């Protein structure tokens, strides 16, 4: 709404400035405005959108974890009653986080995903959808937790199916999707064996395809392969 009067190109320019200034809330607002112009996003623009919201929600998740840890400690035996404030403030942060997730999911549903026909764009958006449902799942404790988890799983699965048919095993989007879906399995779905299998198979299939790549493509792919290895090391 607030960005309705600003040119699409100006919003994109300002998002890039906001990134340079580490003003990620501004960056996300600019990119939301750009999406709401209704035109499809280029690859560079999709990256700006994802970076902005990743940074905003990343900060909220880190804060939520600090507060949840304090709250958990407050409910241990021998802990002095300090009143409702810790729960209230964790709830405040949680609600803000859920709001950001809902905003991103809204942009994806209205109408980024439905207009995305190329594998690279569709997989990228479906990965995002899985990611923001995963963040909702991290804080979910109620009646809809199972449905939230399943929404993440379904988005990731659709992205996986397309990526396996349409993209090479070294494609950074395919790799990043697999990395994140593997984390979903480990941290959300209580499926560490699936997480480990996915990370290993993804790594090994990428390794076998590196020979086809330029130096620059090799750099991109191997960076994400190292993240897969890092997680495997953490988990084994």
């Amino acid at each position: 709404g607030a960005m309705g009067s600003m040119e699409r190109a100006s919003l994109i320019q300002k998002a890039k400035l906001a990134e340079q200034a580490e003003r990620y809330e501004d960056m996300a607002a600019f990119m939301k405005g750009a999406v709401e112009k209704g035109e499809e996003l280029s690859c560079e623009e999709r990256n700006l959108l994802s970076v902005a919201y990743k940074n905003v929600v990343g900060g909220q998740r880190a804060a939520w974890r600090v507060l949840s840890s304090i709250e958990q400690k407050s409910n241990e035996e021998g802990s002095e009653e300090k009143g409702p404030e810790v729960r209230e403030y964790r709830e405040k942060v949680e609600t803000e986080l859920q709001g950001v997730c809902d905003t991103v999911l809204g942009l994806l549903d209205s109408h980024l995903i439905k207009e995305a026909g190329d594998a690279e764009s569709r997989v990228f958006y479906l990965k995002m959808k899985g990611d923001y449902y995963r963040y909702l799942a991290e804080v979910a404790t109620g009646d809809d937790k199972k449905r939230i988890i399943d929404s993440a799983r379904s988005a990731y699965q659709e992205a996986m199916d397309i990526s396996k048919k349409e993209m090479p095993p070294t494609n950074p989007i395919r790799l990043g999707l697999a990395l994140n879906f593997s984390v979903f399995h480990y941290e959300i779905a209580n499926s560490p064996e699936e997480a480990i299998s996915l990370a290993k198979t993804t790594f090994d299939e990428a390794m076998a395809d590196l020979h086809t790549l330029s130096e620059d493509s090799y750099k991109d792919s191997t960076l994400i392969m190292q993240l897969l290895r890092d997680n495997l090391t953490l988990w084994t």
Binding site: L179, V183, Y186, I224, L227, D230, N231, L234, W235
Partner: peptide, 5 residues
Amino acid sequence: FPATV
């Protein structure tokens, strides 16, 4: 915490 992108 594990790596995501």
